[PDB]
Amino acid sequence: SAAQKFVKQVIREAFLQDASDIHIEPRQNDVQVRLRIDGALRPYSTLPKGALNAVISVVKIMGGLNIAEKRLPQDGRVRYREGAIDVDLRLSTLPTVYGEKAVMRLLKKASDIPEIEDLGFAPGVFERFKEVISKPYGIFLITGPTGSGKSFTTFSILKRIATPDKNTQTIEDPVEYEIPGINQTQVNPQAGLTFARALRAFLRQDPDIIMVGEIRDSETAKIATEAALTGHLVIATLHTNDAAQAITRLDEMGVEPFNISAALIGVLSQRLVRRVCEHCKVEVKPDPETLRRLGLSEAEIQGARLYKGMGCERCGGTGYKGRYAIHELLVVDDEIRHAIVAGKSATEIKEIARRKGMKTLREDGLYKALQGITTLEEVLARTI
Amino acid sequence: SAAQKFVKQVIREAFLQDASDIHIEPRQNDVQVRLRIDGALRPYSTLPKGALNAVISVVKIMGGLNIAEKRLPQDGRVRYREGAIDVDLRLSTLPTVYGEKAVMRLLKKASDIPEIEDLGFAPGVFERFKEVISKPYGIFLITGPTGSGKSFTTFSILKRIATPDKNTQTIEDPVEYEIPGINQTQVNPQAGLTFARALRAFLRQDPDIIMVGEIRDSETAKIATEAALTGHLVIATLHTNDAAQAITRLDEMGVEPFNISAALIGVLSQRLVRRVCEHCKVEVKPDPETLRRLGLSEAEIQGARLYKGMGCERCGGTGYKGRYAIHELLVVDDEIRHAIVAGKSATEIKEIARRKGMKTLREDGLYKALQGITTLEEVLARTI
Amino acid sequence: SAAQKFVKQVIREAFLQDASDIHIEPRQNDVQVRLRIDGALRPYSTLPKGALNAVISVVKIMGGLNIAEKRLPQDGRVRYREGAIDVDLRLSTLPTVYGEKAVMRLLKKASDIPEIEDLGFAPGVFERFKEVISKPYGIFLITGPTGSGKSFTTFSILKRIATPDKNTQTIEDPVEYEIPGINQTQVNPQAGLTFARALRAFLRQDPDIIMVGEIRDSETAKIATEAALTGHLVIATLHTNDAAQAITRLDEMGVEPFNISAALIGVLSQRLVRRVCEHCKVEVKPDPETLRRLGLSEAEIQGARLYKGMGCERCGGTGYKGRYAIHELLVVDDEIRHAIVAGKSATEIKEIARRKGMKTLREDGLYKALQGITTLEEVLARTI
């Protein structure tokens, strides 16, 4: 009874709450049910400990798992739908000394991916961003922390450029999104489709745009670079604290600087900071020391403002609803390319880049705090 | 019975005075019982030879081990109590030509998990420990050999962050702490549920917090870090005698250096020394050879104070009263992150960190001796 | 499965437009088939998504792949020699969220068998080509994806050296490069005539020249090696992406390292770079660091004049007009044979040959970029 109601009730709300994840997680006497909302788990409900196993068996069914294989941890995919609700789930079940556990991660659709316009870049760098991502060929990187939008930006760009005339071709594991116009290839070690193999397949597929879900394999750093040189547009993902580091990372991973230089068109770093919920938005003031570090001066600081939430139903009482992306844009030109071929470091490139207009990740963040998206605190609190 | 009371009482003293282990050994009238309090097998008491069977039968009957079996070894788990103590032990016995031997290991209960404030950090390093482990995301490494205090540090941090409202998924083999609010997977080869398989599921299962009791499987090291890279807060336990080299060790475990860089919030190397009993502390010379080897300053020698234990009864007659943890904390800012992605060694990472003010394991320990808590020599014995 | 209707209409159009590739794109509700011409795609037709699965399934049959196997993707060459439409296709059923994408890359026809002077060899690789092919003993291996002219050149070797004084016999799958006056055999796996089996007979013929159309089978790697080992010129297509890697590749395929070195005399990799159409030969004088990092002799980096096609209504506006061959023949001597047994990296064994006069593909292609034939980017794209 309760077990069947339970699985579907949590899943239904997870989509409605836009939880990124659904948890059915057993404890000593009961099961704590939690939804990952705006990047963090919070309680939803509880199951009786007995209901737990009935519940886990039900989700194994929901994801297509082998219901009989209760010794080994398993996973699969739930095409969970309810009325207008439609988000695939990645279901994973696991034994616990407290009974079986199950979690259903929300996977996404083309309709969840923001337009390139919805990504959150400062307008200055955004127009330059669009100019870089619109290039007929060349390396464009999107790098950084969880939820940063490395994936969403990558796909916002890929969808934009996945026009009738372009083989937008990607590497995902499993496919994260359901998107038309783009060949969303899934990594499959049984087939030999490792990330490096999947990019070898990318070139064999005669592509227009590469998407490397994460450039982990050294070979993917090189293949993505080759792709750029071969006349493909290259979009690839890393985890860096800045754009100059991401270029540096292409060299740290073994990509020759003469290719990075010829191929590179721009590097983007990106991260998430909480967004103030509109239903409770209120004007507050910023910390002037941070603002002085931005170069704002007393002259502009005197009129500076930040926003926070007062709390509302939309934000779950936290004052914030969703998180927004912050962007660093290393638009690449001749001086940067001369620095790259020479083998220059992230610091050396960064100095050129800022002189050339590279609004920094931190700066775009603090800027968005100042433009009313967030607070000059959350920005600082989500980096290293 | 005398044996049952003996066992409950020795266990109480062992936990109360901080033994790592309880040693009950074969002797021809009488049985020698020692407690490894503060690392030394301090004498505790004795029993008639026939007590080897009565007392060990208690160790086994409680452990869940077969009493009659005296040829093959056994290893169990018991929640034991007397006086101020109610704490878990591992229970094991050894087949012996002279009659069995039994030793019980001082596991702590979930309810005994210390606040991070209770881990022995001086206020300075403490605030940094707190700031590191409380980072909204990333991996914290806890390192060292038998006698380092890893499980308390490991679980202390967990106590602070894995509230009942947060999803947590822990790997143990077998379970030591249990711990409502946190899902605890016990590794089970019957299934094929390795630490790696346990984490394979944890990753797909999206907990906020991941804990691994021992990073032994390569895949386990990688996954725990993978989550930590972008947003999960991860606690990992492993063997290393240097906070910066620990980074190198995680690289050795198969975790991509770039993954480590992004994930890592800090590394703590630990060691425990004997605390001097207050009621018989002896202010010492201090010894010039011991001091020379350690490098103590006249500022310390002529004003800070080192003590030895003389004997105060309350110390088991050995002059000491419990372990004093010594802590070497590497705080991972983004310069150290750079060093990591750059492939830098402990020397390079440590030198950057010391240039930033990082206190070494010997500097901390010696301070602790100089705080009048421990002995100059106890510190020396576990460092250079 | 029709599916196949489109597969056939598409293939016919792809050849007529000289598309480099066919893209049967699995989509959300349908399948979008696109052709690649001069750096961009154009749509041809669509199929129902259900037809996609039928496409994937039938193309698997076509490639000799298992139609019943869709737990994983498959790939292979399809002998679609449909009269006027007779370019061989590289089938890659790469799995996406919408099913596998049936890419079919176009592999070239005999295209007349050239003299070695018609291949565009630099004097370095040219004279060495002449030297290597003139031999009575040893394997002359050629690399790059079919369509890059491997077999074009492989058969050029025979055209030039299979004189009335020499016993020549070749085996292919299917015969791709016919040469009048030369005895050609086609494999027949149905009979059991693997390449190895044929080559085994070739050993038995005490031939002067033994051709292998594609050294792909493990048995064949061993026998093709024996083909030369036993005292015969062997000429072969080694279907990999690098001449130097081709050496190591025989070892990768299970060929005794020793037999491989005994068996080899020269390995050529070749590619074609897109041309700059004269009009837009803009002398983008090089950054010497690019050229130096490319391993271009200092003498050459100084004489170097890099180009970039402007794009340029006569290209256009890609910056390029058609393709131009570049070459790297690793003439083999004893330094190379040491390296062959060793299984050295492509770069090092190639560099050894480079100093023998083998303008590496990077030196040669770059030299051609440096003359305005092609551009930096194309060279890097083809030579990294």
Residue numbers in the entry:
A (entry chain A), B (entry chain F), C (entry chain D): 505 to 888
What do the paper's sentences say?
A third vital component of the TFP biogenesis system is the assembly ATPase (PilF in T. thermophilus). The TFP assembly ATPases are part of the extensive AAA+ superfamily which form molecular motors, using the energy from ATP hydrolysis to drive mechanical transformations. The domain structure of T2SS and TFP biogenesis ATPases is similar, in that they comprise one or more N1 or GSPII domains at the N-terminus, followed by a C-terminal (CTD) and N2 domain- which comprise the ATP binding site. Here we present a combination of X-ray crystallographic and cryoelectron microscopy single particle reconstructions of the PilF hexamer in two states which are used to build molecular models for the complete PilF hexamer and chart its structural transition on binding of ATP.
